[PDB]
Symmetry: D2
Subunit: 150 residues, 4 copies
Amino acid sequence: MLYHLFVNNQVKLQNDFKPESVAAIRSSAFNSKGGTTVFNFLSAGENILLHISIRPGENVIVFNSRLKNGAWGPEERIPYAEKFRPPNPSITVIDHGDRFQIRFDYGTSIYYNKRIKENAAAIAYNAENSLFSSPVTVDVHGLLPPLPPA
Amino acid sequence: MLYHLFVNNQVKLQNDFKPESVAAIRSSAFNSKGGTTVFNFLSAGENILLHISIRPGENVIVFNSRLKNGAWGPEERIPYAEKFRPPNPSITVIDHGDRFQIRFDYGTSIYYNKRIKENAAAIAYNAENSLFSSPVTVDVHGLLPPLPPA
Amino acid sequence: MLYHLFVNNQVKLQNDFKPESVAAIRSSAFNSKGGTTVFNFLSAGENILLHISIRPGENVIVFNSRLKNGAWGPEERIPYAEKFRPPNPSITVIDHGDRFQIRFDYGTSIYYNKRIKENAAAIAYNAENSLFSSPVTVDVHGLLPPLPPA
Amino acid sequence: MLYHLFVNNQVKLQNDFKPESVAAIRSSAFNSKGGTTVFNFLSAGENILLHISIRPGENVIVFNSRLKNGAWGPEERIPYAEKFRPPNPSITVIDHGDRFQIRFDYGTSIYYNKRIKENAAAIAYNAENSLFSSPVTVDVHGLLPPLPPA
């Protein structure tokens, strides 16, 4: 399913993002002078199951989770540099049941253990000066689709 | 190369759309009550190499070409019905040297012989009440990419 | 549909190879010291609709057609050099109704006007010392499948 | 990279199968009356990193590991039923660092924690009366390739 996720907005998924689900987020640009850029996978109750905070200024990408009216938990990090490939940077999130796999354009995948056992119903995108285009292209699959030879 | 083509606007191509090139246009939605929706492949001099005019009101899809300061040439029509697949209808245009191949979601491919021998430097999208989303996701290839088993 | 086409043998297609059909033939190797290698798309009546003769010794790739008990017609050619990419060379054939599009790994596509208006029921592979592996992987589609970003 | 893995034989990988790697194994057929069919991912020292034992007779699929000159470790079983889709059943193995992801044609992915920390240098295929074709088409990726919209 194709969605157009606009900055400081969200998209309601036709189906729950759950184990086996894949979200292929692609940007039509890379604004090298952009600031903190966030992608959140939300549950129906608006609990932030997966928070992805790309912070060029801090040269790090933070992953976290929190209930709608709860406190952020400990942050998990990975360096920002050499993760995105301009001019079409991307983020791919896959639900593996007990954890999330997040792949950017370079480097190895990041694995984040689920903290809030609930499926996602929407995906949000926030930024005051996004590193990416608005909107970003998002193809969501219920399962890994067939793969081309390369 | 991924581009986001907004309605009543256009995108300048990083490279010339020429033989072997492929443009996969995908809409995040289908607006059943939409009106005439157009897609133009323009050369650097603004000549309309390929005019795709979807007319639900006339229940037809029209193809044509014309120079920047010239009149339209003869029209080529095909049925509008049974072409687009909601909620993510699509259009795929391939340059085969002497002609363009246009594929929709249903039916056999449509072939339009080239009338203006120039490569396209841009793609335009116009509509007062677009049948499709704005923007539309557009992936342009320099050549057919590797194919998945399905 | 996936098939394993062995050298000096053939595969009977589950469905007729016809307009919109795509055959993605891939080899698991490139034997640089191989000789003339042939791929034929046959009709039920065993008429050779498309004959693809790769001749390294003559540095050319010949395309032709002939009825089961008929004579070969005029040959159409294209240089052999810089067409295949080792170690996994490929050939992609697409039926466009009035002609065939044949793409290798490099260079522009080759277009061959149909001479025998009939659909194909089988694909044959012949060679005494094939440039390719035995068998070759062959995925046949009833129509162009969705395309990955690249 | 495309390989053709013949039954009761193996293929040496051009590169190490390691984290991020993906092996898409596809059979050109399904032999309903076939017997126990095995796929092994072996390290350079011939240690069996991942043993995939499909047992229709026991109606189960077994996963295990062992050193070249060692005994088998504890077995992990899953149902055989509702896994493979004829006529072209498939198996997809992805290396996620600390574990392997194994996907068949139906059902959710199976995860097998790594037991031997070595990368695989080869893939073996054994069976007296294989459930699958011989050879099997195998596409090995160094990382997840771009995904088609479907």
